[PDB]
């Protein structure tokens, strides 16, 4: 029995016939689950069946999350979000905090259900329509609609704020030595305190949400052999930019130098104190690269000179919420991978490397995905919003396997693109 609160009017951006995305297949293991969870939502009253008559549609999928709670339903409202107009109470009710990034640890709560109580405009509903499918198509698709707030959608967190906040209101005044950020289905909470205490105080917040308007979070499982939960914790502070840029040629050859100078060139685009010319000279004239060890200590003065420039913080970072965010991933070497984020070309705000995850779980994609995820999270905590992803993988591919490893409660925007050596110059800074 949904709350008696009045309803917020939601009419997406103009000239936007809502979504019309199709439903990729899903595994048995998923259907069943997705089914169950989807069915009792109908019971409680949350969701209502509908038929063909509804033109609109979006996709959904299971996601066996490692914890005491069942799998999770997931609805790709990505496109929906795009269509729905701008909301002030969103930005307003959901502003980004700084000190946030500055803490000893941060945790993440799946606080979706909160949305389950507040209703939803009768009309705007048709724009949430989804469809569960079947093996071998025993029967046709079976579609549902959201009546209340759907778990994951711009508009959703946008409204419930009032509620969301006041609920948290006590916790803060109760001890504001911790901070909290909301992002769609998720609650970001960080305490510079000791892990255990942090973990406990976290647990407090849980119970609180419980007693308050039955806001019920997941309960991440914890065990003895390879202790994953011990790590669930999120401690940023130890988050430096990808300081991977070097060389030390004690007898630089034609290639070595040549290669490098092709590299140094590109760097001039980010950094100012760049000088490829000095070395270009040591290279001047159709020499035999092969074996030629044209050792030149004359240019050595300007070669260790660029080093100074490469060793520090690129002065220019001028973050801008009014502009979008971006990220490139690079497959630089087996195991490890790379991220760089910005809004303006060759002018990144931060960089890094998600490496191997010390597990025999060898699988290109898996990592890539994992990459974006941990990349994202990171980005969220900072400037707040979510970067677009120039994906180092071929479409058809990424598709058929990303769901199997995803684990967030949101899904960022991604696009596929080929890669040149320019950045493969280990200098991931695009």
């Amino acid at each position, epitope marked *: 029995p949904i709350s008696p609160i009045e309803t917020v009017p939601v009419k997406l951006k103009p000239g936007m016939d809502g979504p019309k995305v199709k439903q990729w297949p899903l595994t048995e293991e998923k259907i069943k689950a997705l089914v169950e969870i989807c069915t009792e939502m109908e019971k409680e009253g949350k969701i209502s069946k509908i038929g063909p008559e509804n033109p609109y549609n979006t996709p959904v999928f299971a996601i066996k999350k490692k914890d005491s709670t069942k799998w999770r339903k997931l609805v790709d409202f990505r496109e929906l979000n795009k269509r729905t107009q701008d909301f002030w109470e969103v930005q307003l009710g959901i502003p980004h905090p700084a000190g946030l990034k500055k803490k000893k640890s941060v945790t993440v709560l799946d606080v979706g259900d909160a949305y389950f109580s507040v209703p939803l405009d009768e009309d705007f509903r048709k724009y949430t329509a989804f469809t569960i499918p079947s093996i071998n198509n025993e029967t046709p698709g079976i579609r549902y609609q959201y009546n209340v707030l759907p778990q994951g959608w711009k508009g959703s967190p946008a409204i419930f704020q009032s509620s969301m906040t006041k609920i948290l209101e006590p916790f803060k005044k109760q001890n504001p030595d911790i901070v909290i950020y909301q992002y769609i289905d998720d609650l970001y909470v960080g305490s510079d305190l000791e892990i255990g205490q942090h973990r*406990t105080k976290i647990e407090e917040l849980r119970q609180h949400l419980l007693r308050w308007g039955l806001t019920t979070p997941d309960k991440k499982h914890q065990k*003895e052999p390879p*202790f*994953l939960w*011990m790590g669930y914790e999120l401690h940023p502070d130890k988050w430096t930019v990808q300081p991977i840029v070097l060389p030390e040629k004690d007898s630089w050859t034609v290639n070595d130098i040549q290669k490098l100078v092709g590299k140094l060139n590109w760097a001039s685009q980010i950094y100012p104190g760049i000088k490829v010319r000095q070395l270009s000279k040591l290279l001047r004239g159709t020499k035999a690269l092969t074996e030629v060890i044209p050792l030149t200590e004359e240019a050595e003065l300007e070669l260790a000179e660029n080093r100074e420039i490469l060793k520090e913080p690129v002065h220019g970072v001028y973050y801008d919420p009014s502009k979008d965010l971006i990220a490139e991933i690079q497959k630089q070497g087996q195991g490890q991978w790379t991220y760089q984020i910005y809004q303006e070309p060759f002018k990144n705000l931060k960089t890094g490397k998600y490496a191997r995850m010390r597990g025999a779980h060898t699988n290109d994609v898996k990592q890539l995905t994992e990459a974006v995820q941990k990349i994202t999270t990171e980005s969220i905590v900072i400037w707040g919003k979510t970067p677009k992803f120039k994906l180092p993988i071929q479409k058809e591919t990424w598709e058929t396997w990303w769901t199997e490893y995803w684990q967030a409660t949101w899904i960022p925007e991604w696009e596929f693109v080929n890669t040149p050596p320019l950045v493969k110059l280990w200098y991931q800074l695009e």
Partner: antibody, heavy 123, light 108 residues
Framework: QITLKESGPGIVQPSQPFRLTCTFS??????????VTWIRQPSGKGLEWLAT???????RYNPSLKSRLTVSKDTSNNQAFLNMMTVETADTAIYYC???????????????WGQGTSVTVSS | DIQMTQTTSSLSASLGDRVTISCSAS??????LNWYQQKPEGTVKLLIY???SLHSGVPSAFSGSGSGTDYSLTISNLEPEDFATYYC?????????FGGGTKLEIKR
């Protein structure tokens, strides 16, 4: 530093039950990676694991004992216990209680113990 | 429920001798072992976890190594406190199992 002493009967007629109590002084049985373990060292034999009481209340007993084995822990007063029923000779030994704790993502040991407790079975 | 084994039940070395002890499991355990030393006065202390991470407090003289299903405990030079039964412990498959410790008697 944290420590703990165990206590019980020392002597118990066969086919009966007994209750051993381990009183610790350092950690609490309410912290994420804490726990208390029970071990039994027989006449000359080595180290056998009876069981381990965990903070979140997830207890794991020995497959060969659970049946006639049961644990508990008055959390509030830093006291966990071991209960063994219909105790037959063999069971007669020096039981110990150790603070087990999950150090990190890859570590969990019995950081601290405490001179066991004799328990003899005999008519 | 792993099968833990300490082959060389007991040995007799002398002061300063470097000694090595062979611990064997019944399957890959992945550095999931521990080394305790029981003192003849009954006491039982923790030396090393994770098969090689030294327990804050144990003399450097002690060193961890091993892998797969075969692991090793060793000390550099002997000093009369060490002549004890040393136990090997796994924390993989919950039926945690201690192999039959190794006595470390003096040679005369």
């Amino acid at each position: 530093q944290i420590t703990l002493k165990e206590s019980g009967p020392g002597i118990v007629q066969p086919s009966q039950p007994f209750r051993l109590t381990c009183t610790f002084s350092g950690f609490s049985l309410s912290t994420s990676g804490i726990g208390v373990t029970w071990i039994r060292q027989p006449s000359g034999k080595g180290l056998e694991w009876l069981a381990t009481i965990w903070w979140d209340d997830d207890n794991r007993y020995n497959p060969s004992l659970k049946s006639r084995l049961t644990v508990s822990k008055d959390t509030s007063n830093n006291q966990a216990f071991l209960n063994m029923m219909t105790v037959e000779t063999a069971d007669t030994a020096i039981y110990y209680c150790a603070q087990s704790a999950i150090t990190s993502v890859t570590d969990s040991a019995m950081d601290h113990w405490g001179q066991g407790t004799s328990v003899t079975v005999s008519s | 429920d792993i099968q833990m084994t300490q082959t060389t039940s007991s040995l007799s070395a002398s002061l300063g001798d470097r000694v090595t002890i062979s611990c064997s499991a019944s399957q890959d355990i992945s550095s999931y072992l521990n080394w305790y030393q029981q003192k003849p006065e009954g006491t039982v202390k923790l030396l090393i976890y994770y098969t090689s991470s030294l327990h804050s407090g144990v003399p450097s003289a002690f060193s961890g190594s091993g892998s797969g299903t075969d692991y090793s405990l060793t000390i550099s030079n002997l000093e009369p406190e060490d002549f004890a039964t040393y136990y090997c412990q796994q924390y993989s498959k919950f039926p945690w199992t201690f192999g039959g410790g190794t006595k470390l008697e003096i040679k005369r």
